[PDB]
Ligand binder design. Structure first.
Ligand code: CA
Lengths: 10, 471, 92
């Protein structure tokens, strides 16, 4: 998961 | 070897005149994934921000559509419009102007089929949905993200827009993407799901660098790539024809619907997109709820080039008075009647070329499609107060049979008699055109087609499925 | 007959900018005259307005930057179908 749409995904 | 998402959209047996427009952040157009096949239109309409983060979103999605190593339609030609600023944020007005820019481009220098990817969402917008509808009626294919808020996609735009393909996101376990309060939207405004978590693609950090991103935009980019390939093989496809193919070639019933809210599991399509390998297409269309008036009605409709071959209804209360098919503006429509919290109308819309269809309203040992060379495709039924292949059975009720002119068509009726859920399924090669219940001991809450499976819900019980195929 | 609409998600609304949508058959010349008519009536009342864009090709109408106080004036203009307050969209 990235803030341009932070976390591990899957 | 192969990234999971590209393998999942590959059918279990498997073997450029299209342009794909992207409305996104800026793009890193010289990234080796997409270099040479993405034309930056340098249209730009963004609000001011309240450099590698700037084009992160758009570069990745262009890669998912057209990338040389991790793309769905490798080598597909793209054109980009910047409507999202560096913080990922845009306006409805800017999106309108960008959509208008695409239409003016097409008018000035026509090309072939146009697929427009809209990897963005805001709240329900009357004007944005109207503009997408007009762009679609002018021949353009629009593919949009369902939205990232674990919510009903009908509350967002352009997700809720009429003639667009709205795509939700699933993960490597075919389950809906969730991140706490966030996650894929759902509901009757979503047309299908596609890989949307842990999607590797072009990273704008460097010309050859790759990053894993997640979103309903990533899912919609998979569908935009599949659609672009479908339109290259069949450039004459209408939007209703393309949507029927996307549904038909999807993986069915792989999503664990327990992730969705209870009232949304019947309304949300259990489909994960897939490429075609290398005929009668039907789809189920759900209406919105009707309300708890005793005369409240609900209406499900088909696409302009689609035929309405059947009509059923569903109430969780079980308090319903049936449904009926009737013309409206020169087109058949599915009307459902409340008895009761409310009801849904459930239409079955099919592509049957070289076919004239009609409704025959009569009481339920007669025949309801009496003309020659005519097949019965659906048996509706409605009643007024609240308590043999071409005939409809029923008890005080009135029948609405759909009878179709179709010389190349063959239909067979299969029922299954036995409780909360009884199902009967068409055989492989057959298309479910109609689904209804036969009343008995239990009180029928409703019936609806799920792909080629007739589902009846109760509280005996017999499900009745009408299955057709072009011989 | 003419209606107003704004986004139900309050943090996503963008007050001050409005999409004036006109009836389907309105020609681009009528769209531009309607917008200048709005600008003129707004100036008489002491208001400053800016026409940001004029729409044609998909929907007829225009994008105006103005105070919301002008919305009942603008809803009375000829050919107006509905007006919508601009709102945010986000990368998904
Ligand atoms: Ca939709």
């Amino acid at each position: 998961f990235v803030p341009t749409t932070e976390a591990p995904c899957x | 070897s192969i990234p999971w998402n590209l393998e999942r959209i590959t059918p279990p047996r498997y073997r450029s005149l299209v342009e794909v427009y992207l409305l996104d952040t800026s793009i890193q157009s010289d990234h080796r994934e997409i270099e040479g096949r993405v034309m930056v239109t340098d249209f730009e309409n963004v609000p001011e921000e309240d450099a590698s983060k700037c084009d992160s979103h758009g570069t990745h999605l262009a890669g998912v559509v057209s990338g040389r190593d991790a793309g769905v339609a490798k080598g597909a030609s793209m054109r980009s419009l910047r409507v999202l600023n560096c913080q990922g944020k845009g306006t409805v007005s800017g999106t309108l102007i960008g959509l208008e820019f695409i239409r003016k481009s097409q008018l000035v220098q026509p090309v072939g089929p146009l697929v427009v990817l809209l990897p963005l969402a805001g709240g329900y917008s009357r004007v944005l949905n109207a503009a997408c509808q007009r762009l679609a009626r002018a021949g353009v294919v629009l593919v949009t993200a369902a939205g990232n808020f674990r919510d009903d996609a009908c509350l967002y735009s352009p997700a809720s827009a009429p003639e667009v393909i709205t795509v939700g996101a699933t993960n490597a376990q075919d389950q809906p993407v969730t991140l706490g309060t966030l996650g894929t939207n759902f509901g009757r405004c979503v047309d299908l799901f596609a890989p949307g978590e842990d999607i590797i693609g072009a990273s704008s950090d460097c010309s050859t660098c790759f990053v894993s991103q997640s979103g309903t935009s990533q899912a919609a980019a998979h569908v935009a790539g599949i659609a672009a390939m479908m339109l290259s093989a069949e450039p004459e496809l209408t939007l209703a024809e393309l949507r029927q193919r996307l549904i038909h070639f999807s993986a069915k019933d792989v999503i664990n619907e327990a992730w969705f809210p209870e009232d949304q599991r019947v309304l949300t399509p259990n489909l994960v997109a897939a490429l075609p390998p290398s005929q009668l297409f039907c789809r189920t269309v759900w209406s919105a709820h009707s309300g708890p008036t005793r005369m409240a009605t609900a209406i499900a409709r088909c696409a302009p080039d689609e035929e309405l071959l059947s009509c059923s209804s569903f109430s969780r209360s079980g308090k319903r008075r049936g449904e009926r098919m009737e013309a409206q503006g020169g087109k058949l429509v599915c009307r459902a009647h409340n008895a009761g919290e409310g009801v849904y109308a459930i239409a079955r819309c099919c592509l049957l070329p070289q076919a004239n269809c009609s409704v025959h309203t009569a009481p339920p040992t007669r025949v309801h499609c009496h003309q020659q060379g005519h097949v019965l495709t659906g048996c509706s039924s409605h009643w007024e107060v609240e308590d043999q292949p071409n005939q409809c059975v029923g008890h005080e009720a009135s029948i609405h049979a759909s009878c179709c002119h179709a010389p190349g068509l063959e239909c067979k009726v299969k029922e299954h008699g036995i409780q909360e859920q009884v199902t009967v399924a068409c055989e492989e090669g057959w298309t479910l055109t109609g689904c209804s219940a036969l009343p008995g001991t239990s009180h029928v809450l409703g019936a609806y087609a799920v792909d080629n499976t007739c589902v009846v819900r109760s509280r005996a019980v017999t499900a009745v499925a009408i299955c057709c195929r072009s011989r | 007959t003419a209606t107003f609409h704004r986004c139900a998600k309050d943090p996503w609304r963008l007050p001050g900018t409005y999409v004036v949508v006109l009836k389907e058959e309105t020609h681009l010349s009528q769209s531009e005259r309607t917008a200048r008519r709005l600008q003129a009536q707004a100036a008489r009342r002491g208001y400053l307005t800016k026409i940001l864009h004029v729409f044609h090709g998909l929907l007829p109408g225009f994008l105006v930057k103005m105070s919301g106080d002008l919305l009942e004036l603008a809803l009375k203009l000829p050919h107006v179908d509905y007006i919508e307050e601009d709102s945010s969209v986000f990368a998904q």
